[PDB]
Amino acid sequence: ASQTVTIPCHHIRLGDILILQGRPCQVIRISTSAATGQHRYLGVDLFTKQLHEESSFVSNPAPSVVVQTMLGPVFKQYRVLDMQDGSIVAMTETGDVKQNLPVIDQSSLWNRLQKAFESGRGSVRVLVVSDHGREMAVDMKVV
């Protein structure tokens, strides 16, 4: 399962990727539980596209400190060596080659990647989520 970071709930917005029920999910709705007052997150699984919901974790790490948090995935950043048929050849920081790295069909990433890739390949990075063995490019950056 994906490595994670803890995100304060005040810093979570629609479109952020959270772990919901153990699954990396794009947040599509943020609401407050009437029963508990806590934030509830409705999200779309990046891989399966199924809906998942999870409420915030309330913790009390110190006197008068009440924290509502969620987990987000730790993104990896890969270089793009080539693009072929909806997948890319990516390279990790240590030179490990991923031949068939899926690109998520989300927010026109493939077209944005293609565009950025045609006008300087070396500066194109993909942000990659790695869940339960599976990896996928879910965003891109230019260095």
Residue numbers in the entry: 31 to 173
Question: Could you give the paper's own sentences about this structure?
Answer:
Here, we present InCellCryst, an advanced pipeline for producing homogeneous microcrystals directly within living insect cells. We have demonstrated the pipeline on five different proteins (IMPDH, HEX-1, Cathepsin B, Luciferase and EGFP-µNS), representing a selection of soluble proteins of different source organisms that crystallize in insect cells in their native compartment or, in case of peroxisomes, readily in the cytoplasm or nucleus of the cells. Importantly, as shown for IMPDH and HEX-1, InCellCryst can produce crystals from native protein sequences, without purification tags or even remnants of proteolytically removed tags, within a quasi-native cellular environment. The rich source of biomolecules in the cellular environment allows the identification of native ligands by co-crystallization at quasi physiological conditions, representing a unique feature of InCellCryst.
The 2nd generation cloning system (denoted as v2) uses cohesive ends produced by restriction enzymes KpnI and NheI for ligation, significantly improving the cloning efficiency, at the expense of two artificial residues at the N- and C-terminus of the target protein. The disruption of the native PTS1 signal by cloning into the pFB1 cyto and cyto v2 vectors transformed the hexagonal crystal blocks into a spindle-like shape. Whereas HEX-1 cyto and cyto v2 both formed spindle-like as well as bipyramidal crystals, HEX-1 ori crystals exhibit a hexagonal block shape. For HEX-1 ori and HEX-1 cyto crystals diffracted at 100 K one distinct unit cell population was found, whereas two unit cell populations were identified for HEX-1 cyto v2. For data collection from intact crystal-containing cells at 100 K, we carefully transferred the cells onto a MicroMesh mounted on a light microscope stage. Cells were then covered with 40 % PEG200 diluted in cell culture medium and manually frozen in liquid nitrogen. Serial diffraction datasets of the crystals contained in viable cells was performed using a helical grid scan approach, available at the EMBL P14 beamline located at the PETRA III storage ring (DESY, Hamburg, Germany). CrystFEL is optimized for still images in high multiplicity collected at RT at XFEL sources and thus, can be directly applied to serial synchrotron data. All HEX-1 structures show an increased flexibility between Phe145 and Ser151, the C-terminal loop region after the α-helix.
